[PDB]
Design a protein around this motif. Structure first.
Motif, mmCIF file in Angstrom:
data_model
loop_
_atom_site.group_PDB
_atom_site.id
_atom_site.type_symbol
_atom_site.label_atom_id
_atom_site.label_comp_id
_atom_site.label_asym_id
_atom_site.label_seq_id
_atom_site.Cartn_x
_atom_site.Cartn_y
_atom_site.Cartn_z
ATOM 1 N N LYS A 437 0.811 -1.208 0.000
ATOM 2 C CA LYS A 437 0.000 0.000 0.000
ATOM 3 C C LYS A 437 0.848 1.263 0.000
ATOM 4 O O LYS A 437 0.293 2.367 0.027
ATOM 5 N N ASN A 438 2.170 1.125 -0.030
ATOM 6 C CA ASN A 438 3.082 2.259 0.004
ATOM 7 C C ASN A 438 3.317 2.774 -1.409
ATOM 8 O O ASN A 438 3.751 2.022 -2.288
ATOM 9 N N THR A 439 3.035 4.054 -1.619
ATOM 10 C CA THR A 439 3.151 4.710 -2.908
ATOM 11 C C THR A 439 4.322 5.688 -2.908
ATOM 12 O O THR A 439 4.657 6.256 -1.864
ATOM 13 N N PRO A 440 4.989 5.877 -4.049
ATOM 14 C CA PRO A 440 6.017 6.920 -4.134
ATOM 15 C C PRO A 440 5.410 8.307 -4.006
ATOM 16 O O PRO A 440 4.289 8.563 -4.453
ATOM 17 N N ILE A 441 6.164 9.210 -3.379
ATOM 18 C CA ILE A 441 5.731 10.586 -3.190
ATOM 19 C C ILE A 441 6.712 11.510 -3.905
ATOM 20 O O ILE A 441 7.720 11.075 -4.465
ATOM 21 N N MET A 442 6.391 12.803 -3.883
ATOM 22 C CA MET A 442 7.129 13.787 -4.662
ATOM 23 C C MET A 442 7.083 15.087 -3.873
ATOM 24 O O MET A 442 6.060 15.378 -3.249
ATOM 25 N N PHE A 443 8.164 15.865 -3.898
ATOM 26 C CA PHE A 443 8.254 17.067 -3.071
ATOM 27 C C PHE A 443 7.950 18.316 -3.888
ATOM 28 O O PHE A 443 8.696 18.666 -4.804
ATOM 29 N N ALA A 444 6.872 19.001 -3.525
ATOM 30 C CA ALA A 444 6.368 20.146 -4.266
ATOM 31 C C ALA A 444 6.903 21.450 -3.685
ATOM 32 O O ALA A 444 7.339 21.515 -2.534
ATOM 33 N N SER A 445 6.860 22.496 -4.508
ATOM 34 C CA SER A 445 7.408 23.798 -4.153
ATOM 35 C C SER A 445 6.636 24.874 -4.902
ATOM 36 O O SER A 445 5.999 24.607 -5.923
ATOM 37 N N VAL A 446 6.709 26.099 -4.386
ATOM 38 C CA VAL A 446 6.087 27.251 -5.031
ATOM 39 C C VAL A 446 7.038 27.792 -6.088
ATOM 40 O O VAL A 446 8.146 28.242 -5.771
ATOM 41 N N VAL A 447 6.604 27.751 -7.344
ATOM 42 C CA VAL A 447 7.409 28.171 -8.483
ATOM 43 C C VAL A 447 6.691 29.322 -9.175
ATOM 44 O O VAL A 447 5.482 29.252 -9.421
ATOM 45 N N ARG A 448 7.434 30.389 -9.472
ATOM 46 C CA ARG A 448 6.879 31.524 -10.194
ATOM 47 C C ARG A 448 6.578 31.146 -11.644
ATOM 48 O O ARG A 448 6.991 30.098 -12.145
ATOM 49 N N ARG A 449 5.837 32.017 -12.320
ATOM 50 C CA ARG A 449 5.405 31.761 -13.683
ATOM 51 C C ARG A 449 5.501 33.037 -14.508
ATOM 52 O O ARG A 449 5.505 34.150 -13.976
ATOM 53 N N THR A 450 5.593 32.856 -15.827
ATOM 54 C CA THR A 450 5.618 33.995 -16.736
ATOM 55 C C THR A 450 4.241 34.620 -16.912
ATOM 56 O O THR A 450 4.143 35.813 -17.217
ATOM 57 N N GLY A 451 3.174 33.833 -16.745
ATOM 58 C CA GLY A 451 1.831 34.366 -16.910
ATOM 59 C C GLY A 451 1.412 35.304 -15.797
ATOM 60 O O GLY A 451 0.678 36.269 -16.039
ATOM 61 N N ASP A 452 1.861 35.041 -14.573
ATOM 62 C CA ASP A 452 1.592 35.903 -13.427
ATOM 63 C C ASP A 452 2.865 36.012 -12.605
ATOM 64 O O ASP A 452 3.396 34.997 -12.145
ATOM 65 N N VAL A 453 3.356 37.240 -12.424
ATOM 66 C CA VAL A 453 4.570 37.444 -11.639
ATOM 67 C C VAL A 453 4.304 37.148 -10.164
ATOM 68 O O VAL A 453 5.101 36.477 -9.496
ATOM 69 N N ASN A 454 3.157 37.595 -9.650
ATOM 70 C CA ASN A 454 2.774 37.361 -8.258
ATOM 71 C C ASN A 454 2.131 35.980 -8.139
ATOM 72 O O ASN A 454 0.907 35.820 -8.136
ATOM 73 N N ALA A 455 2.980 34.963 -8.046
ATOM 74 C CA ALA A 455 2.533 33.592 -7.796
ATOM 75 C C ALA A 455 2.619 33.268 -6.306
ATOM 76 O O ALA A 455 3.289 32.330 -5.873
ATOM 77 N N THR A 456 1.914 34.072 -5.517
ATOM 78 C CA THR A 456 1.961 33.983 -4.065
ATOM 79 C C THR A 456 0.943 32.969 -3.554
ATOM 80 O O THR A 456 -0.107 32.749 -4.163
ATOM 81 N N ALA A 457 1.280 32.332 -2.430
ATOM 82 C CA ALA A 457 0.394 31.366 -1.778
ATOM 83 C C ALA A 457 -0.665 32.133 -0.990
ATOM 84 O O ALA A 457 -0.522 32.428 0.200
ATOM 85 N N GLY A 458 -1.753 32.463 -1.680
ATOM 86 C CA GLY A 458 -2.832 33.227 -1.087
ATOM 87 C C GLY A 458 -4.052 33.297 -1.981
ATOM 88 O O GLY A 458 -4.450 32.297 -2.585
ATOM 89 N N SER A 459 -4.658 34.479 -2.069
ATOM 90 C CA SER A 459 -5.802 34.697 -2.944
ATOM 91 C C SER A 459 -5.308 35.014 -4.356
ATOM 92 O O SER A 459 -4.122 34.865 -4.668
ATOM 93 N N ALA A 460 -6.237 35.459 -5.215
ATOM 94 C CA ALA A 460 -6.014 35.798 -6.626
ATOM 95 C C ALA A 460 -5.426 34.607 -7.392
ATOM 96 O O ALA A 460 -4.267 34.611 -7.817
ATOM 97 N N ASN A 461 -6.267 33.564 -7.485
ATOM 98 C CA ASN A 461 -6.072 32.301 -8.205
ATOM 99 C C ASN A 461 -5.024 31.402 -7.549
ATOM 100 O O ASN A 461 -4.091 31.881 -6.897
ATOM 101 N N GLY A 462 -5.189 30.088 -7.708
ATOM 102 C CA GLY A 462 -4.312 29.145 -7.046
ATOM 103 C C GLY A 462 -2.930 29.089 -7.667
ATOM 104 O O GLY A 462 -2.705 29.493 -8.806
#
Lengths: 550, 550, 288, 144
Positions: A437-462
């Motif tokens: 029942k053990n599945t591989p996992i993966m480590f996620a991070s907050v990465v900026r994008r060219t479409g939106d400079v403010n890729a902040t962990a908050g409001s104004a889209n995920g």
């Protein structure tokens, strides 16, 4: 007249010797071990060797079939806490070790537990039949604890802490299926293993405290508390690890992935410095050299300056190329701010500094297609934005920084990048697969994008969660030390991470990946309430890790 | 004081006696096994003599009626894992064998088992009233293990190692129905049998181990663990066995199928060699020789190519010809790359090679029809793609390669191509019929097709399966040795295949077919998580083999 | 090794009663494990004095027979399950059995019955499908006889007219992502050098197996381009063909030996040949 | 490795009487066969305090001489023929003896007697008859 419900620390309970605890075995072990000099820490009044102390607690589910290994330990000083403290104080050991098993089950449970002592020459894995060894059988309704002493059977005079050689292994597997005749939420009990050195245990030589040995040090120190909730980045981009996401089915990352045996399959040593190349052709479409996209490509095998492998330059990112044409920016990818530079002691060109997207293509400069494999391909790079100048010299190269971002057109919710079907692999790689029942996992991070400079962990889209394979401090700790003998293969070294409302276990197998007992769920688990991490030790792959979450 | 919850490996438990176990039987057994010489391996302090080692586990559910037999073991030295090794160096054995039963039930359960030693010569199966023998009743709430001795009730002086003779049988049938007084999904317990040679067990005369070996006295080593995982092939397609395909309607296989009597009824050696036939007629339809389809035929019974049988040459598939005309690809047929050579020179002709579907038909010059029977039919080959020109020579010859692929009209995969309705069979072969809940199986394999070359397991177009009756190592070992005195008719030889989640059993008939107990289920077994294959010995044919993959 | 300068026992050739000598267990270990025993003594019977027959003739040989028996101090120490590391992992005694070398076992190149032993006095070296005692191969094939299947290797045909044309296929070594072991060549590829041949001339002593060419975009094998293709290795594909031994810098190259009407010229094309092969001979007469 | 926290002895640079340590035979075997002796203890001489010279330059090195004597429990076992050998390097000591430099012996460019040795600062490269310690060379001209 103790009732049996309360047990002392010095109380063994009922002693069960299988067939290998013999008196002349102890006499031939005591007299042999004087080759290390006078025996040390041999005084059977000291409280560290007369009391039973906690080693490792494990679970026993009703889903465990007979023959499934629940707790296996190789003979070591590391099975007792005080013997593991004195193990860094001394340079060799010799003698047995009593293991005391307490079963937390009521009188309404049923099922049994087999317990054998495997001889040292026997390889332990899938084909091992535990119940065809001399064993003891322990009922789940055991009130008094059962002590099974593993003696020191060895073809050596003593066991060095650097090269112990062949040690016996206590295997406590399922004898009979545990039955709770009740259904419901209750489907598991707990068995605790206390440990106490036997009457013939001894150390021999001194050595300096925590003197580094031939033996691989156990990798409980490379994964600590601030890695999950503080400093510590991922393998592809330099961003903080904000969570984990279990991929069901498996994946294969072999860019900056180091095995537990110290070696890499792939290029790009773990440091986000820069990407450089010298040989490669540049071109441009269109009859006018104005407002065009520069088109660089070179074959896989021209990375002479790379001192690890020739298939890619240093720092080249490991994803399949998504082809695009026209002003529409492609979905996902790895973009990075760079510039062209010509060879023969040539400065980088002033008028062309633009964001280039990198990847592996096939069939350049015609029909560009994604490719799964690094072998038999060619590295490519073309800009997404418009440059008023273009070069067409046959010797040309790139100068791009090593950390990048993900280019997306609309960027409302998107999809975590890269996908497991998008990551190219250096060939001949071992693939992570979900076992049990053990599945591989993966480590996620907050990465900026060219479409939106403010890729902040908050409001104004995920946000967009760029996913990397293993933590870069862990890769730093694994790229210098060799851990070929740290854990026996077929298991993973498990820990215990505790949040503010629950706890979960993750293990580190010999391939370098991480497994957790999340089951068939693609839920992003957030690391915000994580507090402390405590090491446990090795644990076999069929043992289901807990997923107790609020 | 030793509590009854924990048991020693040398502890018999409660020694329940039966009226078949007497002092007169034991005194007679020693006094008449003395003709073998002095007793061998009778040292009473040996670890293999004194300890109970694993024999079997089986499930007792609440759905089992009284009189239903759960366990059946034959008296043999292959019960114990150590008297099965010591019998490789001795030419006989005589004496008894204790069996210890540990019932993992709680105190809230109810119901009882029964344990009788059936004398030899009595049929074992449904309708056998165990409770009207001299018997021992065992509660489901029993905590201490209960052991019962098998007396050596034999008509011979001793049992020879190859042919033992008539032996007693031990049955554990339901005396009283198991009750869980709660009601729910937790309605099953488990009983574990261990085994240990009795005080009167012995081997009588010594012999060289380079005599009749382990591959001639019992078919235990025909199915090993690496055979069924990734090494052994099937006897029809020469591809890796990657599954078990249940056939609930039953099938019959003639070619390359060996029984336990070491004889085949088909026309192929136990290998994958070429098909080569002399003086079979060839022709082409019409008059013009552009894009013509090559036709070849020869009557069955005339191929003097084999030392075994002459219905068809060596390596000929037992597949019926599906007719096809023009540029239409046939469906579900054995097609292999072939050619036509002149008999007067032996030189294969230059242009007439193709992918020829090979098969059997009844009428060659007129309408082609499929056939199953070999008597009166003819071996018929015909290419499936166009060949420029073609031989019309009447004494001509045909040469096709050993392995084959699947003729598919499109790239999409279909079901397994050797369906039982189209399998060429000589008159006289036995049929694999279901016996109770047990059903015949064929060992599936990934076999590629002419609609998709790159079709492997897990391909997105769909996997193509080709099934053969026996594994190739099994039929290779069946053609060299004789197992007539190893399995009486009405019995299986059962192996225990354990997976990563559950376990299941397959059994080998006297006629050579394999039998898994799945009922009317037709779902293919995955066989990719197979970790252990071990033999458990002769079991009755009318007993449901345990099957639970989870 | 001077046996006569050890502690030794001299045995006459005229000896009538048998002579027995005990091997002591001169070991550095506590006991010998069954799988890895460690360092063990050796027993040698060398010639002390030259055997003389005082007659002279063709009867100049005698025979000595060794039998063996465990000493009074021999023992086994701890018991273990026989379903552990078996007889096929502790010693390679059971790899060569009696039915293997008579009529059942095949060879690792041709999948035919082993009917002889061919001595090679100059010596040879075999890379493909050859496993050492360390359980590792240096070649590019699994231990079976499966098909050769490769994706995105270029195919072409010489000239312009497509009547009776010889099909050509080639792909560089090191680029075949088909195996989990090594990627110089796909699985089942013969380790045979290409003997070049042009026109209607049958090549001599080459691995030739029945093959075909499939498009990579569909997977469908083409209708007419099947033949007996000689499979091998070469160095230069577009110009003159030459044989090669080394794999580094060479390329896997296939070419049919009989005429095929038309033929694929697709660059991402694929090649599918069968497992076993036959011998390309210019005449009906056998060769070495 | 941190030798200063092992059981050790201290050896001063200006000591008259020589300092004696004893090496026990701490072995996981019962003896060491000559040829494959297995795990043996090592004896490590580390610097406890670095060497200081109050004069300045000139003499900046001190020779320390190691002497060896068997202890009471040393023994040999299992006598063998002397033709069997284990150390076959010619330690690489025997290839250059005293008459090589004051007598017979010659160069790699001429068949002339060696009478000088001349230092060169910066380095040089020669690969004709210049063999490395391994069994190979980089060039033509086998040495004859």
């Amino acid at each position: 007249s103790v009732p049996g419900t309360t047990t002392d620390g010095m109380d063994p309970g009922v002693v069960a010797t299988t067939s290998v605890v013999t008196a002349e075995n102890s006499s031939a072990s005591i007299a042999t071990a004087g080759i290390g000099g006078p025996p040390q820490q041999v005084d059977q009044q000291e409280t560290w060797r007369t009391n039973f102390y906690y080693n490792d607690v494990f679970t026993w589910s009703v889903a465990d079939a007979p023959g499934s290994i629940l707790y296996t330990v190789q003979h070591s000083p590391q099975n007792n806490p005080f013997t593991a403290v004195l193990s860094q104080m001394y340079a060799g050991w010799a003698g047995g070790m009593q293991f005391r098993f307490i079963v937390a089950g009521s009188g309404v449970f049923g099922g049994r537990l087999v317990a054998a002592v495997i001889p040292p020459g026997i390889e332990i894995g899938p084909g091992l039949e535990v119940r065809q060894f001399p064993h003891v059988v322990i009922d789940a309704r055991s009130l008094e604890p059962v002590t099974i002493t593993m003696p020191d059977l060895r073809p050596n005079m003593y066991h060095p802490t650097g090269d112990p050689g062949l040690v016996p292994t206590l295997v406590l597997s399922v004898y009979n299926n545990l039955i709770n005749p009740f259904g419901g939420s209750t489907s598991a009990i707990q068995v605790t293993v206390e440990t106490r050195p036997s009457e013939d245990f001894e150390f021999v030589m001194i050595r300096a405290p925590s003197s580094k040995t031939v033996d691989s040090i156990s990798p409980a120190g490379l994964l600590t508390t601030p890695v999950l909730t503080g400093v510590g980045n991922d393998n592809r981009w330099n961003g903080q690890i904000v969570g984990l996401q279990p991929v069901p089915g498996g994946f294969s990352t072999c860019n900056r992935h180091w095995n537990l045996n110290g070696s890499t399959y792939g290029w790009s040593s773990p440091r986000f410095a820069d990407i450089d190349h010298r040989r490669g052709s540049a071109s441009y479409p269109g009859n006018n050299a104005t407002n065009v996209l520069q088109f660089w490509y070179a074959n896989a095998g021209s990375a002479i300056d790379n001192p690890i492998s020739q298939v890619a330059p240093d720092g080249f990112p490991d994803m399949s190329f998504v082809p695009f044409n026209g002003p529409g920016i492609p979905a996902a990818g790895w973009v990075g701010f760079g510039a062209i530079w010509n060879s023969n002691s040539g400065a980088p060109n002033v008028t062309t500094v633009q964001a280039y997207e990198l990847g592996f293509a096939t069939g350049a400069p015609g029909n560009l297609q994604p490719t799964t494999n690094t072998s038999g391909s060619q590295t490519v790079a073309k800009s997404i934005y418009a440059v008023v100048t273009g070069t067409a010299q046959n010797p040309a190269g790139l100068f791009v920084m090593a950390s990048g971002v993900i280019s997306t057109p609309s960027a409302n919710a998107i999809t975590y990048t890269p996908q497991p079907d998008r990551i190219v692999t250096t060939p001949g790689t071992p693939a992570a697969a979900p076992v049990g029942k053990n599945t591989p996992i993966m480590f996620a991070s907050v990465v900026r994008r060219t479409g939106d400079v403010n890729a902040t962990a908050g409001s104004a889209n995920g946000t967009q969660y760029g996913t990397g394979s293993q933590p870069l401090p862990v890769t730093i700790g694994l790229s210098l030390n060799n851990y070929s003998s740290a854990l026996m293969p077929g298991q993973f070294f498990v820990w215990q991470l505790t949040f503010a409302s629950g706890f979960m276990e993750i293990g580190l197998s010999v391939d370098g990946y991480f497994y957790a007992g999340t089951g068939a769920s693609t839920t992003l688990i957030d690391l915000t309430e994580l507090i402390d991490v405590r090491p446990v030790g090795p644990r076999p792959s069929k043992s289901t890790l807990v997923f107790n979450l609020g």
